[PDB]
Amino acid sequence: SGFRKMAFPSGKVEGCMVQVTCGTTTLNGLWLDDVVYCPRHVICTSEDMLNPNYEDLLIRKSNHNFLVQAGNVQLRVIGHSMQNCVLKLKVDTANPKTPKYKFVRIQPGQTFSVLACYNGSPSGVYQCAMRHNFTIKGSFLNGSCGSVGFNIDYDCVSFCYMHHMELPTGVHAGTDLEGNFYGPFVDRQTAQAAGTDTTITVNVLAWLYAAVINGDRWFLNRFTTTLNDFNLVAMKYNYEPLTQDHVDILGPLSAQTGIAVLDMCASLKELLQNGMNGRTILGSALLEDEFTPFDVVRQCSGVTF
Amino acid sequence: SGFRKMAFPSGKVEGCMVQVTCGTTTLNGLWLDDVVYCPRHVICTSEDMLNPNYEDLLIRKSNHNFLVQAGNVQLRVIGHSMQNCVLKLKVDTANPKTPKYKFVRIQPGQTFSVLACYNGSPSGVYQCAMRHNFTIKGSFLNGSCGSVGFNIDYDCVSFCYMHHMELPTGVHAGTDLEGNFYGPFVDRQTAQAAGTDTTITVNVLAWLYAAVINGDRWFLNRFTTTLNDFNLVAMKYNYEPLTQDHVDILGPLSAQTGIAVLDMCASLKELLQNGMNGRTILGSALLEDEFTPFDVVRQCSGVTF
Prior knowledge:
2 copies of one chain form a homodimer.
Chain A: H1 11-14, E1 17-22, E2 25-32, E3 35-39, H2 54-59, E4 66-70, E5 73-75, E6 77-83, E7 86-91, E8 101-103, E9 111-118, E10 121-129, E11 148-153, E12 156-166, E13 172-175, H3 201-213, H4 227-236, H5 244-249, H6 251-257, H7 261-274, H8 293-299
Parallel strand pairs in A: 8-12
Antiparallel strand pairs in A: 1-2, 1-4, 2-3, 3-7, 4-5, 6-7, 9-10, 9-11, 11-12, 12-13
Helix pairs in contact in A: 3-6, 3-7, 4-7
Subcellular location (chains A, B): Host cytoplasm; Host Golgi apparatus; Host nucleus
Active site (chains A, B): 41, 145
Cytoplasmic side (chains A, B): 1-305
């Protein structure tokens, strides 16, 4: 019993983190096989960041402008190339700790673990959700660029995020591991800001099922609503529309608890309309939207890796 | 910027987790050097748990009643002994992955990371605080006994908790790594229940400083209170008394923000007396008490491991 914001064990990713230095800038790289991946803005100066042309900036660099350190062992760079907004640094040694891995791009509403790193050294691990405005609410200080986000499936690490920048509201933006940004953000100095965000409704419902599985039932009621009438109310509260696909994804949780999805939706509708009235759900006084249905199942059943 | 419930990177602990089987019971063990540590109730049957005499039960076991598996490699047990409520299984191979480590007992109010494990396989990592009633609010399913809690200091793993049981309110109890229980709990079937709990006041204040560092300032006010008048109000709300030592521990956070501790206490007093009135602090609608002052400093400054 119990429900916590749980990250994946980070050991497989820790063995891939390196420090990359170009000029006076130092950040983190991801060392898989004989390639180190890092944000391409490692090659920029402060002056370059107003309007950089990264193609020009990279053609002016040599293999020896890049210092890669794997703990103490220096890695010799034998080639470099640009892949969208990430650099690929070819090194002369394959990482002996390379796990089975994939590069996957995630969807808004999905969660992943972040290994926050500084100077190539892991500092902490925590769980994040990709918001509907393609930002994440992370915890990142200066030097954390190149930290990666991932999921673990069986024994395979699915890398889905590398950190590039902090937006002026304190939320964070980055790329997938092919270097393509999540959302309309760019790795240069502009007026860019996060767009409006919505609450991830399917995740709130999942979390309410987690509460029922853990014995919080005070918010339940005898009512059921239709998909249509639920969405009319949830859209008024800045919640994402619920779809028949979302209902189907919630089926396993519906079966385990015996509460139909549209029956849970009637509880959510009342919670939105009345608030919580001084009570809590799974230790929170607000409706949590950063647990997916899979997160709930994995934590409320014995799944390991 | 940003503030998250962050665990330590778990790689160093993952390399120590093994599976221990005795009879039909399987749980987790901690393999350091040539010793495997696990809860002694691995030797019990369901019938034994009403009133076990563990000394009797252990003298009736042989080295070959214990199956230890490190991934696939079976470990040969060459001795066994009881250390309070933990078993020490001597194995013929030192763990090549043993980190620098210590066994430390923690205090209520302190936090640690938990590596939740099943059948010797890590499943997730999350942060916990030891409550004033010596329970933790963990996330543990059947098979998780022997999972350990730890802090990482520089390169040294300080083990402070091993999981033994779930209390009837869904909170969790276990021992330090010398096998001594946190709190008045025992590893047998009794009517034991968690005692009353209080809110960890020094941690709430630390978290309010984290909010100010992250730009939440709406709860601040121009007032200051004395230690004495603050405690009269906080004790009425089931908060732990604040001491001059707590004020001193909060000094660094006071200096970074320029807000005196007793000035922050006046904000907390008003939050307790008035509630939050529909607003949030660092994404929470209630006062969070599971971040220590060190947690705040470590996350609001570049500390790595």
